[PDB]
A paper describes a structure:
The cryo-EM structure of [name] in complex with the guide and target nucleic acid molecules was determined at a resolution of ~3.1 Å. The heteroduplexes of gRNA and tDNA are eventually embedded in the nucleic acid-binding channel formed by pAgo and the APAZ portion of GsSir2. Except for the first two nucleotides at the 5’ end of the gRNA and the opposite 3’ region of the tDNA, the remaining nucleotides in the gRNA are fully Waston-Crick paired with the tDNA strand, which is distinct from the Agos with slicer activity, in which only the seed region (positions 2–8 of the gRNA) is paired. The insertion of Y359 between T1’ and A1’ of the 3’-region tDNA disrupts helical base stacking, splaying the terminal two bases away from the heteroduplex. The structure highlights the nucleic acid-binding conservation of the 5’ end of the gRNA, which is tethered to pAgo through several interactions to form a very tight binding pocket of the MID domain. The AUAs are the only bases on the guide strand that forms base-specific contacts with the MID domain of pAgo, which could explain why [name] showed bias towards the 5’-AU dinucleotides. An unambiguous density of NAD+ is also observed in the [name]-gRNA/tDNA complex, which may be bound endogenous NAD+ before gRNA and tDNA are added. Only subtle local structural rearrangements are mainly observed within pAgon in the regions that are close to the bound gRNA and the tDNA. In addition to the conformational changes in the small domain of the N-terminal Sir2, the orientation of the loop containing H186 shifts away from NAD+ in the [name]-gRNA/tDNA.
Numbering used by the authors:
A (entry chain B): 5 to 473
B (entry chain A): 1 to 50, 62 to 584
Amino acid sequence: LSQLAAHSTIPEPLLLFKDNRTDTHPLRGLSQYGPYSACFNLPGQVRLAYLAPTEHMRKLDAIVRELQNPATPKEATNYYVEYGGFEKVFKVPLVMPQEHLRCLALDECHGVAANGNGLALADKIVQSMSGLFRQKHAFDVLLVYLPASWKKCFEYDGFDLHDRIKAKVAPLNLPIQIINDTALTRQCRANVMWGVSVALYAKAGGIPWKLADWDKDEAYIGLSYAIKKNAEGQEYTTCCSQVFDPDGTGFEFVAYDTREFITDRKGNPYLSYQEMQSVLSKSLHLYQSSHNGRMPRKIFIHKTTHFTEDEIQGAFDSFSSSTEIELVQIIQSTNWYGLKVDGKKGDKPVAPASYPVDRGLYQPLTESECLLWTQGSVMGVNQQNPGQPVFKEAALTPLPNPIMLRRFSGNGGWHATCSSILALTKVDWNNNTLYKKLPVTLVYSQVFADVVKQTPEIVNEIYDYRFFM
Amino acid sequence: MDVLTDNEFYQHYLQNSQHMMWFLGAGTSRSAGLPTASDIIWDLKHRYYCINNHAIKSKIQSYMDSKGFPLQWSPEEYSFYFELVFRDDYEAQRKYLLEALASRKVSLNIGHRVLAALLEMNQTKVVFTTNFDDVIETAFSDISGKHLSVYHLEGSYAALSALNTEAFPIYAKIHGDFRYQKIKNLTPDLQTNDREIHKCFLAAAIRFGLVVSGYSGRDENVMTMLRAAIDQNNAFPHGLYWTVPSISKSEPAVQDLITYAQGKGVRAYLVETGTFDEMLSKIWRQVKDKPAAIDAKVRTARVCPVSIPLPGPGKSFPALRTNALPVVTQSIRCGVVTLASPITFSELKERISQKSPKALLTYTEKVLFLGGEPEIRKIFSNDEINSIGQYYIDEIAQSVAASTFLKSFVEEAILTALLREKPILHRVRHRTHYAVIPNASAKDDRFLDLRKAVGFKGDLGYITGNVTNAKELSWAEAVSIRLEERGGKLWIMLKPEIWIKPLDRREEATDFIRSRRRYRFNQCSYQILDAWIKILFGSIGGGGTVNISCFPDAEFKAEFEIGTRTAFSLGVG
RNA sequence: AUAAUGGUUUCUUAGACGUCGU
DNA sequence: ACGACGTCTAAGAAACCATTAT
Ligand SMILES: NC(=O)c1ccc[n+]([C@@H]2O[C@H](COP(=O)([O-])OP(=O)(O)OC[C@H]3O[C@@H](n4cnc5c(N)ncnc54)[C@H](O)[C@@H]3O)[C@@H](O)[C@H]2O)c1
């Protein structure tokens, strides 16, 4: 026949805010209740400093003046709520820079604008930013403006200016927010305000929200790769890993380099038994060191490629003999898309539904394969209409697309896997929309790999969350 | 400055491993589930502060710093915080320390099993430690089936004699500086037993070489014993190796001990091998004469293949309609042309492109074809061919899943059968197949429903035309057809699309395509898919199946029984 | 790079078969 | 056994355009 067993829907995850109030809408929850960190006052204040040319300094200042005043959404008004100002949503004042926190690079900016400089631009920028190396207790986050002329240096077949600046700034322990010409445009101010205020609060040291279903004994790890493309006849590959909690914080990650990087120059994104074992052992060590030596009872590992013979055994030989391990591969491209059909209502026969399939639907296909949506109709978050769904990608695709899960290990059911992935989708503080296509584990592994790729040396160290977000 | 490398402390242990002693610590047990000293320190400090979040570590640490507590990571916090939290309550202290270091998780890891295995065979003789748990004993008992000889402060009086009678393996649990109370307040001559056990360590270290893993230097009696052992002549003839997870947090006390050992003259290095499990696994990799039984217990065996049973049909009605059509056919007959000399796929493709045959061909261990004998006799001269037979393909699902060439061959046989005897076009782009609508014949009734699906507000639409800002381009409505094997079944995936006439000139009509498909929401897409399915398979939705034939008037044809109803599912309960 | 992710063009990787020579 | 290059399919990273939620 053509009956595809039976599908199930994962209910939309709830988020946790100040005083343990729950809401599925992040911006609405932040507006009504406030950030999660406000309960114990984790960030005392958010102090900013500027780093941009004077002829482009004023406009940067302008954006700060826009971050402490209300705004109204002109686009996507079905989801976005009214912005109330920084000391109305996050309960913490946004402190302007003083006279000594207005650094400049005047003679060094327009020259590289008129030139096509690469690495020297980045190291000169970092040197200019090094003048305040002592008085680092004067601000929390820096706002840096790369002009529309620096676009030529921005990147050319390889080297990336933003990635390399972030890489050189991470050891200096200071978060950075880069403002381009796009943030000062788009005719929808509320979008930019909601996207920058949350990022600044997170980079200051706060936790804007959290997952409500946090009372489980689980942990989550992600693995992703990136092509290095050195100017030669070869092609390097780099990988990274992270650890997350059921509440979804995961503030650290291990930046380990696969084996001896002297005469290896790996050509495919597949770790050997020893390399996978080393990475997972170091990840477990970091998780234990961050949680007072507590070992999770169950581990989820997500990867973009399949698990080879060596990788599964290396994963099983990194944890205890009584910890349940579930290895999942996530495939972004699929031949299925699926449509929603409403049932027979009052004097109304079955017919195709107006809005698309629900977000948390999952369909079993094979004894080891499943289709998860993570994209589609969402109920209860519409602002104007009270009972109309919201499809967030309506301006790009008429219909949502699912993902595939291959589940190389484990013995449990699909519900736990799909619930964990759907919950992990909703905790990206760099993203100002409702959710993402992929869980935060894969996203963060990809971004960490992209940053680590642009580095001449090994860098076997453990870095921080906010330094790359 | 004399610090060995990770790889340099792997050939030395490979060469001489019998003259090696170990001094374990709390960190080596951390991966077994038992928290180390620092984890208890943060617990007691948080308990003094009164499931609580670990995100307020910095504030409580600063409040500690304000009062004037000794220091962070200083070798004084253990006893101080234990006394502060538990006052003089000895029984409560024992109850606490017996609950967080109990056989709770006490689950073995790879390093503990490797160490137990190395204790089984005569590779490592004596192992010292400061722990008072049963991780090593449990691992040894599991791997061997026997019981280890453990000497501790419960009437051993045999360690030094054991070294002389060579009663290996010898596991000596030592009290240290803080096990349940301080070492000072043990009146009943228990300090003399500790002194005897320590005195055994001097003779133990005279002959062997030391490898210290998972130790931080917290204790004072342990450090005094190590210094006294160093003071002995030619102590540690094979050298001393202190392995740490990272040099950046390398315990200035440990650094001072290494400096002293170097100054007095000792092959002492501060080695960095990462974690305990990592180092033990890497050591286990280069081991000779491994018994078959031991290797099964040490490394985790093959894990069973994953199998999650599929649920049954559902009953809720917010239904889900997919785009995949089932294929019921599972047995077809093709042709085989035995050749005098073997050829390659590239040569076959070139010969196919030479003269256009009314047949399909592919190359495996034998060349397979579908069509007519005169066609292949045109593509292949009579001199080279010897005999022409048949090749059965049973259970096409498994053959397609296993072999890749058969996938493409059956896909092309199916699409040739589908598009045969119909006005629909046939186009290929990046190996994907399309069913574009002809511009000349895009007015008859067979496409009328499709027009109704692409209109607006009930008005009719256009299924062919020309791009707006282009006086040479043209566009039509198409659909991509793929064949996918999943779960042992064959599906045909259909996806509506828009085709641009000059294939190399498709980037000049991207905006037109995006504008054309912008409001093609759930209902419009449903109607478009229904119209396309009706166009391709003739019979409207609800029909059971239709048989399609490829090369019907040929010796080696292809009959298929594709199903018209698309796969769907209902909700549980 | 406030963001979301859809297209287009190239580039690889993995697996599976084949021929030759070694 | 095993080194070269062909063939096929499946899947993804890089880099550049585009528009903003019935
Ligand atoms: N399992 C036990 O018996 C236990 C438990 C807690 C405390 N203690 C007490 O602690 C006291 C001092 O012992 P200690 O110096 O070992 O305490 P410690 O906590 O200071 O030792 C930790 C050291 O091991 C390292 N380490 C941590 N995790 C590791 C890993 N996964 N692999 C390898 N190394 C790792 C750490 O960096 C550190 O140098 C003992 O007297 C002992 O009585 C014992």
